[PDB]
Structures are given as structure tokens and as C-alpha cells.
Amino acid sequence: GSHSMRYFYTAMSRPGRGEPRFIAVGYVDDTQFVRFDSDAASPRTEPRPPWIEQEGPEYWDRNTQIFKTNTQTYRENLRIALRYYNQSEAGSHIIQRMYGCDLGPDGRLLRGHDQSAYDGKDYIALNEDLSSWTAADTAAQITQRKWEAARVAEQLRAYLEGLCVEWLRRYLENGKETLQRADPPKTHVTHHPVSDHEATLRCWALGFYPAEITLTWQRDGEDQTQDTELVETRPAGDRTFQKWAAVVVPSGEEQRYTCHVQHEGLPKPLTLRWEP
């Protein structure tokens, strides 16, 4: 949907090197706004974008106690997971969680999320109805029956439909100058001969926000999906993103190829050709 709030939790055990590390990060769309790391000398939750700094001392204290409590909880969970999988206390393991809410165009909950993974594999996930669960194996099935018994989905549903939506709306107001501002991509095409009979055409898209973009190469109006090399969208470091799509074409036929760029920061789709 139009906007979303997401918190990412990562807990990692490291036998022989102290207690398990717990990291938590929060995002509103593609913008990180908070961070917490139990390995920081004097662990506190820190601001990562200007608009969250206006929050008072009690917001920071409340955040910190939640993440400190989570550190303890996930340390217990890593120990429990070992028993469920008959694993020894000599290995290093990871539990990841990702939860949050999506706001639709009208400002109400579009859909909620809450998923957990163990060692990079799905473990348990809250269903879209925000009432039931999907467990990936017989181990997660135990967690599931425990969560059904403690009525956990109900707690999550209350959060996702209420607080998550209220706070996301508040952050969007407070950070409107950036959160609700799309930066269109600055586009250009490059030419790189590979031999006498072929040249590489590269369509670039730089400086855009948000990350979502579409770059297509077309030969006489036909989508060259099979011959286009695309790089994964990458961050620039200043909040914006970059991406390029390339195609190897026969020398002299460059003008039969067009690059199509789609991004919400653009009034209407761009069509680029290589101008020599």
C-alpha cells in the first residue's frame, strides 16, 4: 500500500563470545528512523532521521525498555529453538522477526504483518486475517499451539489495527517534507562498444525516492526482458537510490531501442533513446 511501517529484529548467538546480540531497526517505507543494538556501550535506542528527534525523552525511554526486554526474550528463544531442533549449544544461530502495518490510500489499515524465521528459514507467520498462524514445521507447530493458548494473535491484531496505524500517521505528518515527497529519477543512456559488431546500451536511473521503479528496454516496442541485464536497486547513501538496465545491441541499430522508466515521482512515463 501507499505507506508502511516495519520493525526488523535480529538476535544472534555466538558461543564463547558473550551473550546473544540483539539488533532492532525501524522503517517508514524506505527510510530507517530508529536503531537499537545491545552491543553498543550503554545501549539506547537512537534516532536515524531528523523528524523522529522531535519526540520527547519519554518516547526514547519507552523505546529503550521495550528493546532491552526484547533482548532478554530473544535470548530465551534461541535457547528454546535449540531444544526444538535437537541442536548443540556449540553453534551460532539467528532468529529474525519482521512485523508492521501497511496503510492504504484512505489512511486505514490495508494489511498487517508479523513473521519469524530461524536460521534464514520461515518459522511461523501471522495470517492476513490477523487471527491465525502458519507454522513451517513440527517445531513451529509447538510455538503455534502455545500462541493460540496465550491468545497472541489478538494482541497483535489490536496493535496492528490501532497503535501501529496511529503512530505511522503521526510519523508521516512529522516527516512530510521527505516521507511524502517522491524524488524523480535523473535518467541518461550510455554507449559502450564491446566489439565491431555489438555495443552495450545502459539506461541509468539515479537520485530517486522511493526505491520502487521500473526500467525496460524495448526493441521496436517489444520488451527485451530476456536480453536485459538489470542490477538490483541500490542505495546512494543520501536517502536516494540508483538502478540501471543494459542491453547488447548490433552496431548501428541503437535507435531501434528505447528505455522506458516508470516512477511515482514522474508525471508520466519517460522514453529514452541514445542521442549521439
Binding site: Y59, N70, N77, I95
Partner: peptide, 9 residues
């Protein structure tokens, strides 16, 4: 604001 819910596996 994160959720105030802590449940074990």
C-alpha cells in the same frame, strides 16, 4: 513505536 508484546517460542 514498536509493539509491547513479548512471547516465547
Amino acid at each position: 513505536k514498536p509493539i509491547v508484546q513479548y512471547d516465547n517460542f
